[PDB]
Ligand binder design. Structure first.
Ligand code: A1IB7
Ligand code: NA
Length: 267
């Protein structure tokens, strides 16, 4: 862990807040860790784990992913860019899952949360894979409040990375479902200025972002496949003390670069 120190403190000071980073080289097991056991708000980043929980359930329900879900206008939530285009038709569970992952679609996320038994149901799924840190407590949009000191709707960078590894590379999902989760993450559209900006174009990568809109709070987690070596799993979370502090995508990209440098991954 931190065999090579990196200037995360200067980065977060220039940002005006706190940055939390965990990065794991799945080959050697080496890690980079900075504020990695502090809690940070998940914001929309819970939607990746939501999609994984849906995939886990689909292992016992063979028709789940292709089930058509019809919803009313009252299910739309601000920032539902995919589900608003299918209000009059409905969408399948798999489509809602992909929209939640790849566009952070809020109506899709709340519909899938209901399917799983709400925030406690998603939390139970995370417990079932050995994550004792993650907690979801509220729905969209209330879960974005990012109040300083509030543990609701938070996890730690370390637990996020550990759970992401289990789900994308480990045995927490069966192999077809594992690859589907990876493929949804690879198709994300919201993360081009975050971890992806630190990842060379010739490497494969999937990610899920989160942006709370207050308290300088935003994040990204990713699996990255550098060519010729084992994949890297990493999480970068930010927060800041004042409600009107702005988040920064550049700070997240910069922290990801430092993490890769700390791991000796040439990028
Ligand atoms: B999510 O972070 O709770 C959310 C809520 C409303 C609008 C947008 C989002 C984000 O997912 C956007 C993002 O991922 O950057
Ligand atoms: Na802090």
């Amino acid at each position: 862990t931190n065999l090579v120190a990196e200037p995360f403190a200067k980065l977060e000071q220039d940002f005006g807040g706190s940055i939390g980073v965990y990065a794991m080289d799945t080959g050697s097991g080496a890690t980079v860790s900075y504020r990695a056991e502090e809690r940070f708000p998940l914001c929309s980043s819970f939607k990746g784990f939501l999609a994984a929980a849906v995939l886990a359930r689909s292992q016992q329900q063979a028709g789940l992913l292709d089930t058509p879900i019809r919803y009313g206008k009252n299910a739309l939530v601000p920032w539902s860019p995919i589900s608003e285009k299918y209000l009059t038709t409905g969408m399948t569970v798999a489509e809602l899952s992909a929209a939640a992952v790849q566009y952070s679609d809020n109506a899709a996320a709340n519909l899938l949360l209901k399917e799983l038994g709400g925030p406690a149901g998603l939390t139970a799924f995370m417990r079932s894979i050995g994550d004792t840190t993650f907690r979801l407590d509220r729905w969209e949009l209330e879960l974005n409040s990012a109040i300083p000191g509030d543990a609701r709707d938070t996890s730690s960078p370390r637990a996020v990375t550990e759970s992401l590894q289990k789900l994308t590379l480990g045995s927490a999902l069966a192999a077809p479902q594992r690859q589907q989760f990876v493929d949804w993450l690879k198709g994300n559209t919201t993360g081009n200025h975050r971890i992806r900006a630190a990842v060379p174009a010739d490497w494969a990568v999937g990610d899920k972002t989160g942006t709370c809109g207050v308290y300088g709070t935003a994040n990204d987690y990713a699996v990255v496949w550098p060519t010729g070596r084992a994949p890297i799993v990493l999480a970068v979370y930010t927060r800041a003390p004042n409600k009107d502090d702005k988040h920064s995508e550049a700070v997240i990209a910069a922290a990801a670069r430092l993490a890769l440098e700390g791991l000796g991954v040439n990028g």
